[PDB]
């Protein structure tokens, strides 16, 4: 119901944002892909320098564009060894039924890959990375 049911016309169009200049805007989220390979710590530093975090996966519907992504990329998922549980940079939990986590290399960080996969990787291994900022 863009009107009262769904139809794509010039009148039901909106602006997406606010986002950093020339980022991807989709369903109130801003994304950018960085092709310079960095370790997890430097990827996190790079995103936070732009007032963003690494990719956080919270919804298959709101982030369905993640299905189309080629290759492997740092996201904001980190291991607490004390519990054996995964959480995001922001301290929130990994919600069930979002990611399949796959044991690849022993390590405490995860690479995002399509569709909704996390590959456990050595935090020190250089990789491309995805930054995310919520619009509001």
């Amino acid at each position: 119901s863009l009107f009262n049911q769904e139809v794509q016309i010039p009148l039901t169009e909106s602006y997406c944002g606010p986002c950093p200049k020339n980022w991807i805007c989709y369903k109130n989220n801003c994304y950018q892909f960085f092709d310079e390979s960095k370790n997890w710590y430097e990827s996190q530093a790079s995103c936070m320098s732009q007032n963003a975090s690494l990719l956080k996966v919270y919804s298959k519907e709101d982030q369905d564009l993640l299905k189309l992504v080629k290759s492997y990329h740092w996201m904001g998922l980190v291991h607490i060894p004390t519990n054996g549980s995964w959480q995001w940079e922001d301290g929130s939990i990994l919600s069930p039924n979002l990611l399949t986590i796959i044991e690849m290399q022993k390590g405490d960080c995860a690479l995002y890959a399509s569709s909704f996969k996390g590959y456990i990787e050595n935090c020190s291994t250089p990789n491309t990375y995805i930054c995310m900022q919520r619009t509001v």
Partner: protein
């Protein structure tokens, strides 16, 4: 004990250089057919489609980059197999086949492609390797990820009891063939056994006869997934007492006399 295995296969075809729409995806669990997909129509569920059949589409693009002036049919097959052994050690292989011949493999230890010595094989492999390089298609990480997917799926099938391997002990039966010239043929048959590995042998006063003084069946399939074999030897009437059949199978061992 034989290891457990998971096998993924992706197959595409060209006719006169035109890559056909089909892409066949298969999953075999310990050699046994499990999942078959004709494009995205998968039969034994979102994971069946997503990513998995997608490997066939990537394969259609790889075959489009293989230069071949020979007309008619060509085929490209990608094969992935992981193994979990008794001791929890793992194997993995990742192979590409053109018109039924190996031309490219990925070695987990060197993190490198290996090609065969043939110059036509190396030309096929460089067509493919240069394609994957240009379009960033199949990096080191891809090969390690695909291996990690395979082992994680094998570990899930094993936990679930879907490939539950059972031991099936043999039935052993000894028979005697009539006394032509005062000699008898004693035969020892072991039937309905799993797994395949068995020891069977005639003994004289508890010592195993040589291979050459015995006659040997092959080990044949015996239905419901089991095997059968036999061993025979030629003795003198009077002597039946001295001769026994010795059987070892998955830690069972038994000795069977010639019946009266």
């Amino acid at each position: 004990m034989e290891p457990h295995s998971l096998r993924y296969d992706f197959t595409v075809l060209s006719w006169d250089g035109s890559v056909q729409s089909g892409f066949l995806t298969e999953v075999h669990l310990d050699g046994q057919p499990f999942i078959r997909c004709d494009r995205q129509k998968c039969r034994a569920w979102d994971r069946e489609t997503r990513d998995l059949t997608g490997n066939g589409k990537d394969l259609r693009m790889t075959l489009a980059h293989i230069k071949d002036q020979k007309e008619g049919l060509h085929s490209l097959q990608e094969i992935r197999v992981c193994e979990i052994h008794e001791d929890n050690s793992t194997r993995s292989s990742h192979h590409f086949y053109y018109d039924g011949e190996l031309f490219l493999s990925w070695n987990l230890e060197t993190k490198e492609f290996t090609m065969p010595q043939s110059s036509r094989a190396q030309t096929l492999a460089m067509n493919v390797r240069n394609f994957w390089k240009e379009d960033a298609m199949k990096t080191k990480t891809h090969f390690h990820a695909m291996r990690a997917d395979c082992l994680q799926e094998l570990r899930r099938y094993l936990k679930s009891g879907v490939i539950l391997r059972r031991t099936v002990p043999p039935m052993v039966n000894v028979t005697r063939s009539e006394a032509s010239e005062g000699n008898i043929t004693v035969t020892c048959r072991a039937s309905g056994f799993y797994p395949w590995n068995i020891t069977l042998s005639w003994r004289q006063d508890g010592v195993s006869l040589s291979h050459d003084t015995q006659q040997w069946g092959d080990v044949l399939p015996d239905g419901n997934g089991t095997y059968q074999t036999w061993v025979a030897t030629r003795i003198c009437q009077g002597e039946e007492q001295r001769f026994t059949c010795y059987m070892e199978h998955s830690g069972n061992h038994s000795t069977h006399p010639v019946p009266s």
